[PDB]
Amino acid sequence: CEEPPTFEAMELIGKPKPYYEIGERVDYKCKKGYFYIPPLATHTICDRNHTWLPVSDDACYRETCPYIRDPLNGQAVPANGTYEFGYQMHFICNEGYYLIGEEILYCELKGSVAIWSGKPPICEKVLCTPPPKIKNGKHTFSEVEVFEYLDAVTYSCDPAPGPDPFSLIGESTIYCGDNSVWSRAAPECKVVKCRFPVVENGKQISGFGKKFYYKATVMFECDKGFYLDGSDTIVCDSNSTWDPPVPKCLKV
Amino acid sequence: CEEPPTFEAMELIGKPKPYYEIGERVDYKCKKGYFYIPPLATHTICDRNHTWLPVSDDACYRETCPYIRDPLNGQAVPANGTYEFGYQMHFICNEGYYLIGEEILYCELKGSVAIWSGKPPICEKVLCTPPPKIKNGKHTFSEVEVFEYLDAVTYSCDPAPGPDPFSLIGESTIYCGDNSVWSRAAPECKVVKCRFPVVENGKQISGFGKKFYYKATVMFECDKGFYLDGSDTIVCDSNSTWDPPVPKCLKV
Amino acid sequence: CEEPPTFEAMELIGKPKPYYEIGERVDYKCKKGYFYIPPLATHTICDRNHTWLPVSDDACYRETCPYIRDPLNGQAVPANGTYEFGYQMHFICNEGYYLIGEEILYCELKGSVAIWSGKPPICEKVLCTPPPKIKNGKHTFSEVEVFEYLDAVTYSCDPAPGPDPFSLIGESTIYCGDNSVWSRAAPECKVVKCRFPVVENGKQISGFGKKFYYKATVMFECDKGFYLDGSDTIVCDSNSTWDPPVPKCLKV
Amino acid sequence: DNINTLWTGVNPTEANCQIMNSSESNDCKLILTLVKTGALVTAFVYVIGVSNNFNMLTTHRNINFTAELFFDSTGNLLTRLSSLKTPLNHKSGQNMATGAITNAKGFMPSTTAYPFNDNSREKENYIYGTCYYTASDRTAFPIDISVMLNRRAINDETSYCIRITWSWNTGDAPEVQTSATTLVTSPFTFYYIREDD
Amino acid sequence: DNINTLWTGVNPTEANCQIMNSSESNDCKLILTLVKTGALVTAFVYVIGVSNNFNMLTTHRNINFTAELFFDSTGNLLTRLSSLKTPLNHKSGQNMATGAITNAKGFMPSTTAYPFNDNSREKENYIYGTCYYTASDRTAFPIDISVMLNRRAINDETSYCIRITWSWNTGDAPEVQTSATTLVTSPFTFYYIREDD
Amino acid sequence: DNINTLWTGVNPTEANCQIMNSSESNDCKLILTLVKTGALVTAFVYVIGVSNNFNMLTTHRNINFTAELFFDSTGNLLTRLSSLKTPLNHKSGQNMATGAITNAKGFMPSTTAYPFNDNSREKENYIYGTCYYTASDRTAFPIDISVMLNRRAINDETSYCIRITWSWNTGDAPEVQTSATTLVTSPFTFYYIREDD
Ligand SMILES: *[C@@H]1O[C@H](CO)[C@@H](O[C@@H]2O[C@H](CO)[C@@H](O)[C@H](O)[C@H]2NC(C)=O)[C@H](O)[C@H]1NC(C)=O
Ligand SMILES: *[C@@H]1O[C@H](CO)[C@@H](O[C@@H]2O[C@H](CO)[C@@H](O)[C@H](O)[C@H]2NC(C)=O)[C@H](O)[C@H]1NC(C)=O
Ligand SMILES: *[C@@H]1O[C@H](CO)[C@@H](O[C@@H]2O[C@H](CO)[C@@H](O)[C@H](O)[C@H]2NC(C)=O)[C@H](O)[C@H]1NC(C)=O
Ligand SMILES: *[C@@H]1O[C@H](CO)[C@@H](O[C@@H]2O[C@H](CO)[C@@H](O)[C@H](O)[C@H]2NC(C)=O)[C@H](O)[C@H]1NC(C)=O
Ligand SMILES: *[C@@H]1O[C@H](CO)[C@@H](O[C@@H]2O[C@H](CO)[C@@H](O)[C@H](O)[C@H]2NC(C)=O)[C@H](O)[C@H]1NC(C)=O
Ligand SMILES: *[C@@H]1O[C@H](CO)[C@@H](O[C@@H]2O[C@H](CO)[C@@H](O)[C@H](O)[C@H]2NC(C)=O)[C@H](O)[C@H]1NC(C)=O
């Protein structure tokens, strides 16, 4: 009667024979992670026409793990779709919350009972230490010891240490991020003063003054019969240098 | 036969009828926190004269909690009198001992067995940290780290910082109290020097000298035909002021 | 039949009689820490010749405690020889390992079952804190926080604080010992300078120079008709003194 | 023979027990099986929750509930006093028998072994054990059991008493309002010396 | 009478059970004794290790092994499906009987008390207990037991099921490669309501 | 029938057991009940203190006491060797019977299941459990039980042995000199395969 039919839900009991006689009976059982529901048959007998009688694995139903309730300020996402045997459960915490426990739980089978790998995780509130102390500058909420999610602090430089004031380089306001770390790096309070820009055979058109500090914009225009070599617009950088460098008007 | 009799120790089984027939039987059971002792009956039958037969709650005896042995360096006081159901046990520690655990225990009933709310407390020895450090003064047992009950320390001011010495304001000796706190506030070592008291049309009678310090007593007597306005006796206070203020002799 | 025979492995059941009749039976049982193995008899009957029948304690075998596996980086030594009842087990850790737990375990009997006093000890790796900080001198591995077994550190004095250099007194190299303590005491870096040795009626023969420091060796020879009073060889000690003291050449 | 068993039956359609004071009507199914084993009785006891209030005890941290069983001189259950409102009877397949009870006094705990109001023998009247609760996450929650045989009588009728107390005191409750379904305790088996027939 | 017992016998010469998936042939000796006690069954179960691989489970920290027992409509053991490969029979001194089994259905766990695929009654199908392992140092190691009665069927033949799971999860393993000899669990006794004859 | 039970009786007037070595005469009341349950024996055991020294064991932190029971070839108790000084007999209401013992060998633990001096089967000879002590404050104190069946023989007469060891090792003692009254352990039930009649 040839090899017995193969099924996805049920497996054959014992080794299969290459040939079977008329009247021979073969039995099937639900696989690991499957259970039987009556009345559908799980066995077949070879008929007089040397063929197996109709049989289906419709009686075997999938074993499922218990329903995981979404963790407080987080979520339980079934990566494979359902709670079925051999599947996994992923955990992601909400904005401003960090995971404590197992990020991944696997649906296991221990003594024909479907049970998860362990206890679900907890999503704890995100808290961060005070922001970094900067030289020649101070931030808001200086006496606050513990900072929670989205708590922002604004930095400001100390008063002028003479004729030139302290320049603030970078973002002044920084907040507590999702990974318990401050959103951006702490700014710098440095005395930034650029040299007087003078172009030969060229005249200054914008940004007039005797002193040039951080982010100072100056524009230049060449005289009659002279072409500009570089950029007309120049900005003073954090390291007291003109970026792009001071242009030059060359003769045609 | 009217409503059945009401008792303090036993309660009627089932709802009471407004009227009963001759021969009708009513049963009683010992209330919560009461147990039955034989042979006295807990039931009554209505006789031919339409009255209930004599019955008493004398068979029901009060359920009692176990005997609490007095805690070491403390005492167990039954506030309500006995160990009976619904009563409480209060705990007070002896002089120089503090309570660790439950100050109050209630006599509860769990599965018809009388049991206390919890384990009795422990009376631990009273220990206090070193006394406060005072400016311009020092105390005895300066190197002692831990102080036990009734341990006294005497304060004394440092030597004279010139022509006027340091004055001690308040009690010099302080001891470790029952609440693990020092009996009185630490004294002060301040330079106290009062102004020379001079009364117009009056003569000084007591406390002669050129310098007046803390708690210095001076008395005054008015001249012929002059009355005293205030008090004759004046004492120099802690803030270098005469209390009551310097008197004045006014003309009659 | 007189007193029944006494055995080392088995004891008589009941009080012994001074005299026994013909046919009287006496029974024995294996002592505490002994068990019976068949078929040898543990009882004797008095024969017609007023004597006890042959009986031996060969059936009683000694109760033994479980085999203790040698601890990792240590050893289990049976002080009394075997695992028999009433014996003890001693534990010694290997070179560079210290004992954690019970050094001695006793073979006890609890409910006719031979069991040891407790769990065997663990031999933990020997670790020691940094070596002592010396004045005017420094050691190798100065930034190393934790030192393991046999880790050696070499001491060296700081450069000369003028015309005379720092002298090293004692062993320069110290290692981590077996008792988590440094093998030898930390050396000294002291300025050692001895006085110029001059002997009356005597001439210097060895160790020529203008300055004498730590461990400096000087030899002396007396003039014609003069005998040496003391030792010819003199060594400068750690306290800037000649040991033995400077010799003297006395006239014959 | 069926006469060796005195039981409540197997899973009764309606609740046969009023286990708690707060309940007005029957709150749960008390499964009690008493089997005569020589001079002893094999006592098999467990509860199946019916009412919403009794099933909601799994949402609390500190809980204790007692099943009081009272019997007369002949060894018959006093339903009006006991927690169990249906009288016990012999085995009839998977249900209770209809007819007379053969030696009901025989299933009762001995007054000689477990006395009434004898303070010098108080300790002998107690039996302690453990049963388990199968939680929603399929983990077993241990529940302490306190069994008192005879000891305390409530009236002139109570000649034989059996008190079973299920209790737990934990930091975390077995279930939550959304996970809780039915309060079912695992079967507990205890042994006691039986009174004469 | 001998008919009140349905057992495996006492210490069979050869291994009668294939308890683990990794094994090709029989790995251990399953000692199972089912005694009829009124409307209940006194179930006595323990294992004696035979194979090297099964005895070596004492060297591991986290271990779990299940003894699956499947029975037909008449209450006869299905050896081809069950962990136990030798059919159960009556008492014959210290061994099994040869002849017919008197009321095999009577030793089976009740479908009325322990249903199949009834999720609203799931909790009733479980029994939990503890057995001990006598270690090489003569100390007792506690092992958790999970017993599932009926609940899950594997095919059209399985009418009665008994599943016994021995498990432990500790920081230290019961034995080491040099101390381990034989994996023997202490006898565990559990109680269940029996199906009708 | 009364022949299925082999017991000490119910609460004997005088002490029938000398449980400890230090005692000169009988120190406590050993309540032992052996009931034939098919191929097994329902063993019910607990102690009631009599002597001042035995009752004072509740004032100590580390305590262990063994009740040794020795039996001959026919299954009769050897009083001169055993801790129990009164021989066991059948049920006679709440006391022991006077006449002959029907199949005394039947109540004995099997030599086939529990061998003597077989080191390769040593683990099979042990049974472990837990009983409780009702303290003066009405709280249950857990006591560990170590049961050894057969295994060790003391002489040529001892054919069947039963050893029961009650023990505890805690930081706090169950009672104090003023609170201690009587040392009473809760009834402990264990199961073993019985020897043939
Ligand atoms: C063997 O095969 C034959 C041919 O298909 C089967 O006979 C047919 O059966 C169907 C269903 O009853 C009828 O509709 C046809 O009229 C039959 N045809 C012929 C030609 O007989 C037959 O049933 C099979 N036999 C067995 C024993 O399985
Ligand atoms: C279930 O889903 C998981 C996660 O998507 C699958 O595991 C991933 O498989 C891929 C391909 O083999 C790997 O690249 C990843 O590393 C795996 N991730 C994790 C977290 O395991 C898994 O194969 C799926 N299984 C079934 C049975 O559907
Ligand atoms: C009904 O009440 C009457 C009147 O009190 C009771 O009769 C009295 O009983 C006492 C006690 O035995 C005697 O001392 C009197 O001589 C009786 N007096 C009369 C006038 O009969 C009577 O016992 C009560 N009956 C019932 C059935 O309770
Ligand atoms: C037992 O005694 C206690 C303590 O004296 C009583 O409780 C006090 O009751 C008064 C009046 O209601 C309150 O003002 C106090 O706050 C209570 N104190 C405490 C500590 O509970 C209690 O009512 C008495 N009970 C009985 C049954 O006698
Ligand atoms: C009492 O003692 C006598 C003397 O030793 C025993 O008789 C001897 O027994 C041995 C062993 O059988 C023989 O070799 C000798 O020939 C015997 N000698 C005599 C003089 O009889 C005798 O057996 C003992 N009797 C009992 C009852 O123990
Ligand atoms: C077993 O050996 C131990 C250790 O050698 C013996 O105990 C020592 O006994 C001597 C003499 O009494 C004492 O001086 C020591 O203090 C003991 N040491 C220890 C560690 O106990 C012991 O007596 C021997 N016992 C037997 C039964 O052989």
Numbering used by the authors:
A (entry chain B), B (entry chain B), C (entry chain B): 1 to 252
D (entry chain A), E (entry chain A), F (entry chain A): 129 to 325
From the paper:
The human CD46 receptor, also known as membrane cofactor protein (MCP), is present on all nucleated cells. CD46 acts as a key regulator in the classical and alternative complement activation cascades of the innate immune system by serving as a cofactor for the factor I - mediated cleavage of C3b and C4b. The four SCRs in CD46 constitute the bulk of its extracellular region.
We have determined the three-dimensional structure of all four SCR domains of CD46, which constitutes the bulk of the extracellular region of this cell surface receptor protein, in complex with the Ad11 knob. The Ad11 knob, which can easily be crystallized in its unbound form and engages in a high-affinity complex with the SCR1 and SCR2 domains of CD46-2D, was then used to form a complex with CD46-4D for crystallization. This strategy produced crystals that diffracted to 2.84 Å resolution, allowing us to trace the polypeptide chains for the entire complex. The asymmetric unit of the crystals contains two Ad11 knob protomers that are located in different trimers, and are each complexed with a single CD46-4D molecule. By contrast, SCR2 has moved away from the knob in the Ad11 knob - CD46-4D complex, and the number of contacts have been reduced significantly. The overall structure of CD46-4D can therefore best be described as resembling a hockey stick, with the N-terminal three domains forming the “shaft” and SCR4 forming the “blade”. Intriguingly, the sites for the natural ligands C3b and C4b mostly involve the glycan-free aspects of CD46 and cluster in several smaller areas on SCR2 and SCR3 as well as a large region of SCR4, near the SCR3-SCR4 interface.
